[PDB]
A paper describes a structure:
Here, inspired by the pseudosymmetry observed in bacterial microcompartments and viral capsids, we developed a hierarchical computational method for designing large pseudosymmetric self-assembling protein nanomaterials. We computationally designed pseudosymmetric heterooligomeric components and used them to create discrete, cage-like protein assemblies with icosahedral symmetry containing 240, 540 and 960 subunits. At 49, 71 and 96 nm diameter, these nanocages are the largest bounded computationally designed protein assemblies generated to date. Here we show that designing pseudosymmetric protein building blocks, in which symmetry is broken at the sequence level while backbone symmetry is maintained, enables the construction of very large pseudosymmetric protein nanocages.
Docking this pentasymmetron against C3-symmetric homotrimers (‘CCC’) and designing novel sequences that create favourable interfaces between the B and C chains yielded models of 240-subunit nanocages with icosahedral symmetry. The original I3-01 nanocage can be thought of as T = 1, with one (A) subunit in the asu, while the pentasymmetron-containing 240-subunit nanocages are T = 4, with four (2×A, 1×B, 1×C) subunits in the asu. The major assembly product was purified by SEC, and images obtained by cryo-electron microscopy (cryo-EM) of vitrified specimens revealed wireframe structures with large hexagonal pores that closely resembled the design model. We determined a single-particle reconstruction of GI4-F7 at 4.4 Å resolution applying icosahedral symmetry and a 3.1 Å resolution structure of the 4 chains of the asu (cryo-EM processing details in Extended Data Fig. 3 and Extended Data Table 2). The cryo-EM structure agrees well with the design model, with a Cα root mean-squared deviation (r.m.s.d.) of 9.3 Å across all 240 subunits and 3.0 Å within the asu. The differences between the cryo-EM structure and design model are mostly accounted for by slight rigid-body deviations allowed by the limited degrees of freedom of the oligomeric building blocks in this symmetric architecture. The main rigid-body deviation is a 5.9° clockwise rotation of the pentasymmetron, accompanied by a 5.8 Å translation away from the origin. The CCC homotrimer compensates by rotating 12.4° and translating 4.0 Å, resulting in only slight local shifts relative to the design model (2.1 Å across the B:C subunits). Within the pentasymmetron, the degrees of freedom of the AAB heterotrimer are no longer restricted by the strict icosahedral symmetry of I3-01, resulting in a slight deviation from perfect two-fold symmetry between neighbouring A chains (1.4 Å Cα r.m.s.d.). As suspected, we observed backbone and sidechain rearrangements within each protomer that explained how the V118Y and P90F disrupting mutations were tolerated in the AAB heterotrimer. Specifically, we saw that the loop containing H91 and the entire preceding helix shifted relative to the design model in all three subunits.
Author numbering:
A (entry chain B): 2 to 203
B (entry chain D), D (entry chain A): 20 to 223
C (entry chain C): 2 to 204
Write the structure that this text describes.
């Protein structure tokens, strides 16, 4: 029931780190701050162990998935690491079919109307929107018309100053990083709390 | 059908109608026509879209042209064609719809957003394309594709208000599609609002 | 009202780290696990910076206090950082009076009936029982007779194996250090979970 | 042709020129050459582009590099290669041209605008891509794609004037393609304007 969880939480933290240990510390600060959806970038060194070592948070209520997945092999590795969902930056039929059979949630990435339609034909109703800073909220509010049954989760172009604008456009959730993720755990937790407070009044 | 190039060139405006009722769709279509807009399309985002496109023979007799919008499949296209739609418009490029329309002899105008999509639509014989969303790309994508694609005409559908209208036409567009900025509110207001668009596009 | 907060949560995390940075990382792991009442001892380096930094957690529902307060000037310094409550291992009237004037919840430590009486007649109905490992749950039960209106929050001798024995005796809350906080954040968060998990069963 | 990466990195600028005659094309190519621009692209929108490339051989001897731009077909590519074009540039991604160029051993730089087109282009072995229209996506695209695609090098075309040339370099762009902002008017204007571009790029 991922749309029942994305719709409820309304925010996803995208994590990247200089090491495995750093990734764990950041994940804890983010979780403590009230963000339960965590995406681990899979194009970094290690990565595999970050998802596996964060297992202890899953019992607590964290949902950890894998992001920036390019290849099928990466998808396979993310899955046995126990990733609950995969997010890419391009529609990929091989990953889609693999996840469909496996029982893994996949969010394909789109930028244009043609890509959007080709993803629906595969049964995708929740699409990632990239780059968020290029298309903006007025992309989301427009596709609303011709495609009333499609929801977006954008990354980039989103921060505390304009986060509520994306929700007015009609996004299901927003993915955030650096603006949400950086600096010491002491500061990361504080950022995570200011974001959940703005998204809760909008 | 080449006749469509002249029809678009002459009228320079297309009304895109959306509705949650057959009764209002008809009434809005009339007000838009009354205001001086002859190119009208009924989208398939509305109820018995096929019912609306057939109850409008009395406008066809007056020189109006009724087409179908937001056609996303072959089945919707087929239904629109047998309903009397003179042209088919889609948000994206689709080869199956294109082939169907070609066999039928129905004018088809696919949507593009990128230079790659632009080329592949052109390769299928489509020289008139819909630019969508026209707020994300803007009048600067139409003055850049005059180089590599000198024989392509655009009809932008998205963000066209009485303010921009004259910036898009200086960019070399064939016609502009207008949505809620043209069709909204009561029939009386729509008729006058449509008139405003026809007149401002006569100056520029 | 801190007397109500203690009753609702039923556990207090007592955090003594070996550095400012560790104190913060542990506090986050403990909070992430389920513990909302956290007290920071003055044995921690730059303890006053840790209590003023974790201010940001209060808006998330956290409660931050200070422990091992052995003097009135340590008490004063903490109430400035933002300590919501003061805990000291022994009864100290200088702290007692200071806190009363400031309006800060103060919980003095006792071990004997003599200390209990002189503390409770000073206005303290909630006492810290310390060391809990020495007196045991039998102390808490025995006191019910002569002191029916005195509640305890014992520190030390509390583990997952006997946490529900203290609640059977009739404690208000349990103060857990070492067993809860010792180790890296990924282990602290997990241990904190079971402490909150077991107490929900028995209490 | 791995050598091409080095040539682009060292020069950091490409002059993309258009003309209504071979005489204009030749004079414009010379003007930018003296201005300090060694990478020159001759578009196939010019009716005698193959003649221009052939006759500019005398600059090749001087260390100039002459390529072919706006190639939208295999047939145009074939002619460009025979004329001595050192590289082929297209507005979009063509598999047909990519394969032809690979067999010939001619450097090919396809255009992209989206992350999906970007991924598909690199599956064919293309690590250097043209970003087009640069003015539509902007420098933010280059930064966004420097995450998931850390080994991709961009060369934007359009949107490059003396104001931004140094905001495009801050994004980690390999080189910038400059059109009418560099090549416009007669040779003494063009040569000096071209020099101004080279001076600023040395600054950032």
């Amino acid at each position: 029931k991922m749309e029942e969880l994305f719709k409820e939480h309304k925010i996803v933290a995208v994590l990247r780190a200089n090491s495995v240990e750093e990734a764990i510390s950041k994940a804890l600060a983010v979780f403590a701050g009230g963000v339960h959806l965590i995406e681990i970038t899979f194009t970094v060194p290690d990565a595999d162990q970050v998802i596996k070592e964060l297992e202890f948070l899953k019992e607590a209520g964290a949902i950890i998935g894998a992001g920036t997945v390019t290849s099928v092999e990466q998808c396979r590795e993310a899955v046995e690491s126990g990733a609950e969902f995969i997010v890419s930056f391009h529609l990929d039929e091989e990953i889609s079919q693999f996840c469909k059979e496996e029982g893994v949630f996949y969010m394909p990435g789109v930028m244009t109307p043609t890509e959007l339609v080709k993803a629906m034909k595969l049964g995708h109703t929740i699409l990632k929107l990239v780059p968020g800073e290029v298309v903006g909220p007025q992309f989301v509010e427009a596709m609303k018309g011709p495609f009333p049954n499609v929801k977006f989760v954008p990354t980039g172009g989103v921060n505390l100053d304009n986060v509520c604008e994306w929700f007015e456009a009609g996004v299901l959730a927003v993915g955030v990083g650096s603006a949400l993720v950086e600096g010491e755990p002491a500061e990361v937790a504080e950022l995570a709390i200011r974001f959940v407070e703005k998204i809760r009044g909008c």
